[PDB]
A paper describes a structure:
To further investigate the structural transitions associated with C9 self-assembly, we determined the 3.9 Å resolution cryo EM structure of polyC9, the highest resolution structure to date of any MACPF or CDC protein in the pore form. As previously reported from analysis of our lower resolution (8 Å) structure, the final structure of human polyC9 reported in this study contains 22 monomers. In this model, we were able to unambiguously assign 460/528 residues of main-chain atoms. Further, and in regards to the remarkable 88 stranded β-barrel itself, our data were of sufficient quality to reveal individual strands within the assembly, providing experimental evidence that the β-barrel adopts the S = n/2 architecture as predicted by bioinformatics analysis. Analysis of the polyC9 model revealed charge complementarity between the elongation face and binding face of each subunit. A total of 91 contacts are made at the interface between subunits. Six of these interactions involve the TSP1 domain, which plays an important role in pore assembly and is intercalated around the outer edge of the ring. A comparison to the polyC9 structure with the monomeric C9 form revealed that TMH1 must move to expose the elongation face for an additional C9 monomer to bind to the growing assembly. In polyC9, however, both TMH1 and TMH2 are released and, as a consequence, the HTH region has moved such that it partially occupies the position vacated by TMH2. The HTH further makes new inter-subunit interactions in polyC9 such that it forms a continuous band of α-helices that line the top of the β-barrel lumen.
The MAC represents the terminal portion of the complement system, and functions to form large pores in the membrane of target bacteria, enveloped viruses and parasites. The final stage of MAC formation involves addition of multiple copies of the pore-forming component, C9, to the C5b8 complex. The final component of the MAC, C9, is the only component of the assembly that can self-associate—an event that completes the structure of the pore. To address this question, we determined the 2.2 Å X-ray crystal structure of monomeric murine C9 together with the 3.9 Å resolution cryo EM structure of poly-C9.
Numbering used by the authors:
A (entry chain B), B (entry chain A), C (entry chain V): 18 to 217, 249 to 364, 379 to 522
Write the structure that this text describes.
């Protein structure tokens, strides 16, 4: 068992991209390292400076009949001096001596806590970088209020969020399964022959053979299961799809794409800003217990016994003898296996109450209803995204910018190449029911419940 | 078992839509991914910028004999300086030095809490984005009061809400079913033959065969069920159908539709603003317990026994022998299955009392009547929509705007295409009673009560 | 089992209605969706803008010798400066410098709480939108007092209410039925033959056959029922039929009817303002318990037994044998079903006492007489309509307006078409006693007490 990492050879140098003065080249990954071998360490993509031999046109947008700002975002004239940071670099609340004319008037209006990070541009592994391509500070001069249940406030709705409810949806699943199987097998045998021959001046011949045999098999098995899962949802959100504003640090990174399907830059872009964006989330976070017991007793026995009681004797003078032989054997074999797994997981909430709750779960005693309530009041402060409906990031690249369809054509294939080349289906699978897991480019396998070996080979 | 996602090829590029300068093209989805395969990730619809080769007419409404505003909504002259935000951008309470003449006079008149979000533009999955196409701030210079039971106030009726009652309709269902079936089968057999032959100088021949057999089968079964469901309704609402005002961020998105049935834009519109709007809701929210027990004991036995007691002996001299043989067998097999499911769900109410109530339900002890009362007083703050009578969103697109019937003809087919192409009837169904569920474009199946496999195959 | 929704094809485009500049067309619904199929979603009626090719006359009323107002209601000269909002837009208390001359003088006179919403324009489903076609602010310069029992005040009688009493009519029904049936059947059989034949040097032949049989059947059944129903009535009302004033937002919607029996607009009108108006109601609200128990025990047994005891033996030398055989069988089968349903419902009253009362009902303990009294004092605040005598809405369209009889001829057939096309008698009925219920255009069936299937097929 010895597998090492591998690399494909590099490709050819494509072209000096004239709008970036760099030629790119790339390669792929054949086989990731496995079974205590060398790690691949993500060495795809390469860059090299070159002089532009044939210069491109000046790639800048027209920004027709709109006030250009000091960032690159083009806003309208209606957003002038509105008291809202619309250009990004505060190009409204400085210029004029006119009225600030706030569209949210003297009504009690605050800033939100859930809508401001409403992108959660997610990656296909499952973890979510908050590198939001959206900009949740652009209000576009509107004042739409969305109520809160507990605090009785009036939060705002940013322009990129199309809907934002605050329900209170608590939901506890609970299961406990139980299996048991006893079996007691049993087999006894007793045999006996007693032969006696007598002549008549005589001759005798006796034999008393007494065989016995005995076998038991008293084996039980047991297999429990338990599963608590209590979700707590506080609302949701749904993002938009047309006339969407993007943040400042993202339009530039789309504008710096090599436009010719150069493979090196897109694998950096898709891990800087994620693969998909959560177009419809649901905040508030869960907890979970799992209690997998397992038991396997076994007995087996054997009780064996033999006897021969011979004799002889005759009067003619006298002669006699008496012979005895007796053997006994016994075997007891009592085996036992026992396994207990406990897993607990808990997401969301303040640091002080959630880790009271986790240990009150794992103690096994009953939890008085003051810690789940305190954690559920805590979850308003620190929400954790729990369920999302994805959407690809090339459904977000704007069309106003130059070479938009070519960059979308690049990003629609880069996601296929990213999901293919880092897939788990390149490492050869582990035997004995071992589930292979790609991690750090090093396919580690998890063995079920009995196998301590890396290849799930050694048993107990 | 290995299914991956599939895609149809793209269509042809239709036409530069001259009023939007973009040509659209699209495709469909053949088979969603299933059984631990690649996800489809919603890649329908495509956009591309193009120069308008043949320009359209200037698509703007006439707004005949009405005061146009700084949003696009056309109000009447009666709404001038009324002290109500009718244009959306406050084009009443700024202009004149005349009287504000409030139609709600010095009577105690407030703003509502249930009517202001009275659209709940819903989607066919079951969840409800609050992206209200209606505008519940337009009062049209009228003062219609609707009373409250508990607080004794006088809320208003916005123009888009046609009726709004506040009942107090509490309604608890409760069920508990119970099934049980014991059975005890039993079968015993005893056999015996005793033969004895004697001559007469003699010869004997004996045999004592003693067979026995014994079988039990003592199996019981049990299957409980419980179901609490206590709804609490606080009123309802019924929206209108003619002379309806729409919000500012929705008439623009209808005006930006490609008018030629271009499939890419309508699938973004129908998931920005939902598929249907709740034309008749009922607020106030439920809770629910479900307690599905299951039990299956089983015993079976077997007790077997054999015996042969032969003999022989004669005087002529003497000879005799006595032979004994005896076998015994026993099997006990005692199996047991047990399953407990508990589900609890709770909607509506403040964060502090509802999650006291849920754990007081799941404890199993009796709940003193102070937590259901406190949750029911809490439900006035945070209502949750509970029952609705839908209506399609192409019964809402106004007819005053240009190309209204063509856009309604597009939206009446886009709902059929949306309900067909994301239907569950494309994924091949799971066996063993597994109910397939479309989720994230990845058809996951739920297996009933015994099957841990993805295809519901492995049993216990 | 697979039924989907269906639609008839659309009709022909009728005519540009010249007073509304819109041609209408429509269709019908053949079969609603049923058994987990596609929903119809109410797609009847259609509108389309068209230029008026032949213009109609200016549809406005004469309003002969009456002061026209700024709404469209024509009041008399006697109502000038009376201090009552008669035109709707306050065209009395602004103009003159004369006396306000209130017809209710310095006597203690208030505004009502039950008469102000005295329409309750109801729909044929059973639920009641408060979209009152009547106007319960028009007093017509009269001062008619109607007393109150508890508060000792003097409420007013609006012109649309012809009579208004405040009784106090409490009425509790109570039932408890009980059925029980035990039966114990029993059948035992014992048989025996003992034959013995002896010769005489001999020969014997014996036989002792001993059969037995035993059967029980000890099954009981029980079926309880309980039904509390305590109504509490506080008064009633009776509306008028001639010289009736209607509200401002209803004469316009009658005036916007297409006049040619165009089917699309009337199905929106009849669900904006209901099908009938409650011409004679009775306020104050009920509560209700239902306790349906069900039990079905069953036993059955069987105890079977057989025996053959043969023998033979003769002296001639000697020979004999003895043969025994004995079988035993036993079956016990003990089945049990149990069902408990509880339903509770409660209408009317403040939020704090009614939901104390509901849980004091469902606890099963006796309720001390302090919660029913507090709920009955609460019911003065929040009444709920409980019994009504309907009347069709085309007995309410005024005759002064133009094309009144044609619109009444349209509305007298639109109610027949509405009650026919959304009737439950289009969905094919469910078997096994399943009652079909039309809901959301999706005929769901309810199965009685044992059947969990959608088509009431699977039993227990
Ligand atoms: C994958 O690994 C897990 C780890 O415990 C194991 O339980 C499971 O049986 C493996 N196989 C599959 C198909 O999930
Ligand atoms: C669908 O899945 C559920 C999940 O438990 C199962 O109970 C049910 O039998 C399945 N089939 C149908 C027809 O609902
Ligand atoms: C209708 O459905 C109900 C639901 O329980 C059932 O009790 C009744 O027998 C059905 N049939 C009729 C004729 O009411
Ligand atoms: C990467 O590219 C270099 C270019 O010189 C090769 O030499 C190397 O073997 C690898 O393919
Ligand atoms: C989408 O459309 C492109 C257009 O070039 C095709 O090449 C592709 O195969 C897919 O159909
Ligand atoms: C509705 O009416 C249209 C009119 O073109 C038909 O094409 C359609 O089939 C339905 O009947």
């Amino acid at each position: 068992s010895h597998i090492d990492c591998r690399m494909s050879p590099w490709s050819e140098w494509s072209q000096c991209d004239p709008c970036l003065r760099q030629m790119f080249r790339s390669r792929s990954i054949e086989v990731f390292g496995q079974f205590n071998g060398k790690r691949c360490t993500d060495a795809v993509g390469d860059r090299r400076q070159c002089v532009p031999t044939e210069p491109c046109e000046d790639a800048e947008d027209d920004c027709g009949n709109d006030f250009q700002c000091s960032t690159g975002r083009c806003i309208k004239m209606r957003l002038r001096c509105n008291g809202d940071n619309d250009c990004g670099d505060f190009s409204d609340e400085d210029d004029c001596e006119s009225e600030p004319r706030p569209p949210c008037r003297d009504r009690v209006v605050e800033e939100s806590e859930l809508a401001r990070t409403a992108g959660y541009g997610i990656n296909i592994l499952g973890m979510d970088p908050l590198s939001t391509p959206f900009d949740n500070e652009f209000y576009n001069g509107l004042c739409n209020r969305d109520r809160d249940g507990n605090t009785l406030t009036y939060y705002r709705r940013p322009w990129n969020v199309a809907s934002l409810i605050y329900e209170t949806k608590g939901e506890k699943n609970f299961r406990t399964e139980h299996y048991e199987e006893q079996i007691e097998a049993f087999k006894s045998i007793i045999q006996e022959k007693t032969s006696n021959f007598n002549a008549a001046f005589r001759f005798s011949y006796s034999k008393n053979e007494t065989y016995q045999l005995f076998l038991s098999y008293s084996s039980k098995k047991e297999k429990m299961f338990l599963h608590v899962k209590g979700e707590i949802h506080l609302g949701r959100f749904v993002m938009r799809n047309r006339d969407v504003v993007l943040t400042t640090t993202f339009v530039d990174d789309i504008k710096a794409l090599p436009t010719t399907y150069e493979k090196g830059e897109y694998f950096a872009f898709l891990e800087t800003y994620g693969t998909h964006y959560s177009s419809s989330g649901s905040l508030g976070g869960l907890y979970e217990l799992i209690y997998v017991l397992d038991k396997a007793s076994m007995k087996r026995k054997g009780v064996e016994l033999k006897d021969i009681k011979r004799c002889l004797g005759y009067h003619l003078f006298n002669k006699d003898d008496c012979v005895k032989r007796g053997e006994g054997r016994a075997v007891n074999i009592t085996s036992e296996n026992l396994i207990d797994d406990v897993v607990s997981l808990i997401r969301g909430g303040t640091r002080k109450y959630a880790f009271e709750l986790k240990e009150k779960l794992l103690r096994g005693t009953v939890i008085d209803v003051t810690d789940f309530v305190n954690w559920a009041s805590s979850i308003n402060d620190a929400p954790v995204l729990i369920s999302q409906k994805l959407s690809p990031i090339y459904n977000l690249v704007p069309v106003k910018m130059k070479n938009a369809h070519l960059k979308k054509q690049n990003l629609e294939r880069a996601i296929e190449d990213y999901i293919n080349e880092f897939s788990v289906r390149k490492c050869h699978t582990c035997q004995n029911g071992g589930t292979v897991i790609l991690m750090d480019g090093k396919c580690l396998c998890a063995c079920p419940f009995k196998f301590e070996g890396i290849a799930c080979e050694i048993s107990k």
